[PDB]
Structure 1
């Protein structure tokens, strides 16, 4: 349980996704393929102590411990929609601080062009990292990345809590990335490492299905997925079809960094 402010911009009147579901229906392959596997097995993960290490193309490499996650930077509550590529979405009241405040501390160098994220590796604690089938064929640890300007966008945040309290392990506690305008797979869980690199780093779902998932993965209703239309989505409310929005509804805040490019 923790304190936080509620900035005007991140507050709205969007129908929330019941906490039961936000923490009961998850994708966390390290704990199994089914939507219920994470909530049923994430209990085995030891999220305290913790070590989040910021390295690479940075002038001041730092390192945060479990307490730093909730105490080092001022926490905020942000109500973002969360759109998974599988075509189901939610509206979650996340709690965290913008990645740019952490990156600013580290002072990235003039050669930093990307941010590479990496999930913890603890095979005997995460069953999926032990069985090809339990784990889904992913090459562990789970890894992700963002262009520096994306990582620095005010909208992207290091999440440490949901629904007023610290994160249940199923949601990737103690630290998880959330990039609202992109498909869920970009929001890497239980981050133990953030490295600024010179080249575009590898992405776990891109590696596993190069033909289906890309690096940008910007939520877009006009571009389909090899196996399904992205035009409409299944909203997880209480107890549900609705149109998918351009940039998951953040087009005005984000169009700026993609305009005029590939």
Structure 2
């Protein structure tokens, strides 16, 4: 479904784009199966409209948004970001959405709020992966993720509601999905149902599944490898190899957040 959005020059560029059919044909969405083609083939069984997105926790004005809100409450913008999955493949995608800080501003987070916890919809009857230990990759469902508050407020982190000029296909995490371009793809949680501001660091699906391989921060870094493969290089998914950049190329926009700190 086509939709209206602006094209801020800050997020417009000359990066060669990943074809739309690959953006929505090569996916990781375990709730619909482990294979890259499983989501495009099975995600159609998920009902994305009506939708309820609930903002709560250490917030002063907890609110809830319906499906129409996702595309009208805030002005939409197209941003051409690179998307680097931890498995060493990457894409350049023209997402569409609104910065997460505009949403958090409405809820007005309290002085105790330190982290943001996200949760994906739970519908075992529409999601085959939520029923088979191997089909769903053995992940503890529903999928959960979190960000430190300053990360969630960064102007780069996007609440994504569409791609390539149109609403998001279900395989891409329709109707609302998270995108943090400087981190590995698993941080970009799909089909969000809940956003909670918390005082402590929330749990993370992949870090719970393998604490030794997937960290909480997961910043794209070519110098720190994955226990089972190097992160120095990556397969660009174009039509039909390149070195991985620090923070996936947004180092000068995000380095500030991590200077002088550990992990």
Q: 1:17 Cα shift?
A: 0.1
1-side partners of 2:132 and 2:257: how far apart? 40
Deviation per CA, 1:56-89: give whole Å up to 9, x if none: 0000001000000000000000000000000000
Aligned length: 261
1-side partners of 2:39 and 2:15: how far apart? 26
Q: 1:131 Cα shift?
A: 0.8
Q: 1:159 Cα shift?
A: 0.1
| 1:153 corresponding residue in structure 2 | 154
Q: 1:133 Cα shift?
A: 1.2
Q: Which runs of 4+ in 1 moved over 4 A?
A: none
1-side partners of 2:184 and 2:97: how far apart? 19
Deviation per CA, 1:80-116: give whole Å up to 9, x if none: 0000000000000000000000000000000000000
TM-score by length of 2: 0.99
Which sections of structure 1, spanning at least 5 residues, go unmatched?
none
1-side partners of 2:29 and 2:92: how far apart? 18
Deviation per CA, 1:137-185: give whole Å up to 9, x if none: 0000000000000000000010000000000000000000000000000
Query: Over the residues paired in the alignment, what is the CA RMSD in angstroms?
Result: 0.3
TM-score by length of 1: 0.99
2-side partners of 1:6 and 1:213: how far apart? 34
Alignment of 1:6-155 (within 5 A): 6-155=7-156
1-side partners of 2:200 and 2:148: how far apart? 9
Q: SS where residue 135 of structure 1 aligns?
A: coil
Q: 1:208 Cα shift?
A: 0.3
